[PDB]
């Protein structure tokens, strides 16, 4: 339920490339999408362990394309070690070749509980909650999107901080706000999560 949504999100950015991500640092899924079907072999090497083969799964995506994914065994999802990946066509031709770290491909859930409010001040204050059922909230940095016209505004939020005070906003406009999250801890990394559920607010005038 949450995998397909996150997969589609990553598919939205670079649908052609090989996409790998973790959610809880105890899992890993790599998946790529092609035009409709070829046969492939998924292999990986972790640390000093010998090369292993992953049971590759396949399923069609609406608009008639096929998604090939491998869910690595939990025992082979260790962090801070090189994980070499190799996707080879049945012909022997090379499709993909990556070397990743599990802790550097984190994809969290979207932030929740976004609230917009005015300050006697005419300034807008945004408050939200970190992604649910996720440990180490203190090492999560955010990005809020401010949009009105036809036309946006992006603001970076430092790690651990779950609120933002916006100024220089146009008077009597309808603003809409959204916030996404990602790992910011020095030893970690990943990709921007999906945007949270948006909130709107009508600003006052001069």
């Amino acid at each position, epitope marked *: 339920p949450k995998f397909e949504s996150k997969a589609a999100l990553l598919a939205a950015r670079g649908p052609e490339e090989l996409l790998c991500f973790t959610e809880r640092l105890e899992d890993l899924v790599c998946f790529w999408e092609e035009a409709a079907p070829g046969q492939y072999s998924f292999s990986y090497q972790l640390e000093d362990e010998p090369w292993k083969l992953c049971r590759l799964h396949q399923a069609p995506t609406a608009r008639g394309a096929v998604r090939f994914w491998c869910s690595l065994p939990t025992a082979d999802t*260790s962090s*801070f070690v090189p994980l070499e990946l190799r996707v080879t066509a049945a012909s022997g031709a090379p499709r993909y070749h990556r070397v990743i770290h599990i802790n550097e491909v984190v994809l969290l859930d979207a932030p929740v509980g976004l609230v917009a409010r005015l300050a006697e001040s005419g300034h807008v204050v945004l408050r939200w909650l970190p992604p649910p059922e996720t*440990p*180490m909230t203190s090492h999560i940095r955010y990005e809020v999107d401010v949009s009105a016209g036809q036309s946006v505004q992006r603001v970076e939020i430092l790690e651990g901080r779950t609120e933002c005070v916006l100024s220089n906003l146009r008077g009597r406009t309808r603003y809409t706000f959204a916030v996404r999250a990602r790992m910011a801890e020095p030893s970690f990394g990943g990709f921007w999560s999906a945007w949270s559920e948006p909130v709107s607010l009508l600003t006052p005038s001069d």
Partner: antibody
Amino acid sequence: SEVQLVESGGGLVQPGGSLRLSCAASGFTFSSYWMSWVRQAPGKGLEWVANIKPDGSEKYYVDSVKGRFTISRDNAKNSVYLQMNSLRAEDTAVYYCARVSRGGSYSDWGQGTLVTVSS
Amino acid sequence: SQSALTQPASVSGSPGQSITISCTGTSSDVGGYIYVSWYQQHPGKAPKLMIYDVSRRPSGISDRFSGSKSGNTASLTISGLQAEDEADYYCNSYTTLSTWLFGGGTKVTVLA
């Protein structure tokens, strides 16, 4: 088994003195692993001192060592280094060189080099 | 310095019996990550990795050694206790401060 870690550079030093430790690695792809220093005072427990990224772009230190110790590495020579300046008496310990592996665990250890700070 | 994870000073047991070593921290270290490991050290020798990722064993470690954790406390269990098991045991955990923290250490003694 094939992995080997050999520390060097220890010895006696006056308080405030300097000392540079070296750790020659072999048996694995050195440039793709975190490396670490762990020390152990005589009769006491293990204490983490410093970690360093495979490419050496990130470094972390235990609080009591910040500003005094510097961890570094040379991937071409398969070596880890620990520059220890302004040595204190409480820095007296056996310093181990360790390879960081799965989950950050220390899979391989050197035999350790003794550092003694006294007058 | 950063306070070491809390381990019992010493535990003892008869051969064949099972013993358990505790490792208590906070939700910011032991209970916050799966990056918990256990090490064994015989007198005059370098430490040896027994358990990593809370419950996983490296290649060549006896299945008599097992690891687990609940809440903010990790536990190392040694079944079928032997004379060779007499050593110091340390736990280790990643912390929110981007550091790694050892426990105080536990002296295991086997009585004949």
